[PDB]
């Protein structure tokens, strides 16, 4: 049995209706569970036997379907409803649908931090670029050193969608040795995001 969930990612406004699909390849059964998982938590059972609401689950959650196709519906999205959703039949789970809150576009506030004297004393230089409170999630950060594009010497991380304002934040770290760091002058992060008319460059002179 292979469980195919659709869509991979679903982005909707609160108050709106969500419909998630689960297709079960070799199933002639009417059993299906759905689960909600929030960041840092165990999955929480929502629906069982395709259409019964589990313990403590609100009326806006409903399920239907049987055999090969199933659906999970959320009647009017509350902001607490936004999470990763999995379906399951017997031992098999679907890959997960990420349900995120859709909101108005917000451009990133961009900040850049040179390496600390203390790290420099230890022989290493990490430069950090912060993209604070933006939406949508899609954002491209590029590191330029004396106008030269860097690759494979940076790592990035993104926060979960904020439960208050539904924005994201991103942290990107470019790491060099102290010796390499001092061979160059201008350190820059170039940010591309749909909220920005043109790419924004924040930079500093070592």
């Amino acid at each position: 049995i292979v469980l195919t969930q659709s869509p991979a990612t679903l982005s909707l406004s609160p108050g709106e209706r969500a419909t998630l699909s689960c297709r079960a390849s070799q199933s002639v059964s009417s059993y299906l569970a759905w689960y909600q998982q929030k960041p840092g938590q165990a999955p929480r059972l929502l629906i069982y036997d395709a259409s019964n609401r589990a313990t403590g689950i609100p009326a806006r959650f409903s399920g239907s379907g049987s055999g090969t196709d199933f659906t999970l519906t959320i009647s009017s999205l509350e902001p607490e409803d936004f999470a990763v959703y999995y379906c399951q039949q017997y031992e098999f789970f679907g890959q997960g649908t990420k349900l995120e809150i859709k909101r108005s576009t917000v451009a990133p506030s961009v900040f850049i931090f040179p390496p600390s004297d203390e790290q420099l004393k230890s022989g290493t230089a990490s430069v950090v670029c912060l993209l604070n409170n933006f939406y949508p999630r899609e954002a491209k950060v590029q590191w330029k050193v004396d106008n030269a594009l860097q690759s494979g010497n940076s790592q990035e991380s993104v926060t979960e969608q904020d439960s208050k304002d539904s924005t994201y934040s991103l942290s990107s770290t470019l790491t060099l040795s102290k010796a390499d760091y001092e061979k160059h002058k201008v350190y820059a992060c170039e940010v591309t995001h749909q909220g920005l008319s043109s790419p924004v460059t924040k930079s500093f002179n070592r």
Binding site: Q89, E91, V158, S169
Partner: protein, 221 residues
């Protein structure tokens, strides 16, 4: 109320074996199967097998046959999962779970809190904590950003607070990234009014329990 309480986080070298326990309460232990499901970081759910505590009978997922062993001790209402010949891709959160109903037992209404098992050849190491000082390059409007870089620790997790938890608004602590060194690194930032940079003190508090490491770093302009 049903409770499933699992043992604590573990760290293992490739080739080692790990054993995790799950203690059940609030119901008849022998009346339901216990399942084990794991979730690798950033990924989905995988069933590993079940055990029938009434008999000791088990059913393991095909991929774990010959590697996994499930047992139970009825007298302390506890189920165990042992996984041997570990590899780095066994790094995951392992959960015990109990089905809601009996004739079809796969609706997991009850889950343990999860046990993180990190599989790696790295050794435990406290983080270095470096200030991310606020300046004109970290200022927009009358708002500035500052933070901490918590670098080169193993294993996960670390906790980061600001002013001992007195400062929460505007704080973002980022998910750790696993570096090519086999060590983790993360940053925690906070935005504050730029006028307050001269009067309010900002300290980042980094706690890394696996190495009993606690570190307070003052972040100044």
């Amino acid at each position: 109320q049903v409770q499933l309480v699992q043992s604590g986080a573990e760290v293992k070298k490739p080739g080692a074996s790990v054993k995790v326990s799950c203690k059940a309460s609030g119901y008849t232990f022998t009346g339901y199967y216990m399942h084990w499901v794991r979730q690798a970081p950033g990924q989905g759910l995988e069933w590993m097998g079940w055990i029938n505590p009434n008999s000791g009978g088990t059913n393991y997922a095909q991929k774990f046959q010959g590697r996994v062993t499930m047992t139970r001790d009825t007298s302390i209402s506890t189920a165990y999962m042992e996984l041997s010949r570990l590899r780095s891709d066994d790094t995951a959160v392992y959960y015990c779970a109990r089905g809601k109903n009996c004739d079809y037992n796969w609706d997991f209404q009850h889950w343990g809190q999860g046990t993180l098992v990190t599989v790696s050849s790295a050794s435990t190491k406290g983080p270095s904590v470096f200030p991310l000082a606020p300046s004109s390059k970290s200022t927009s409007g009358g708002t500035a950003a500052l933070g901490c870089l918590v670098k080169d620790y193993f294993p996960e997790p670390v906790t980061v607070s600001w002013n001992s938890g007195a400062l929460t608004s505007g704080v973002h602590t980022f998910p750790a990234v696993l570096q090519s060194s086999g060590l983790y690194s993360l940053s925690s930032v906070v935005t504050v009014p730029s006028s307050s940079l001269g009067t309010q003190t900002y300290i980042c508090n980094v706690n890394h329990k696996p190495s009993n490491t606690k570190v307070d770093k003052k972040v100044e302009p």
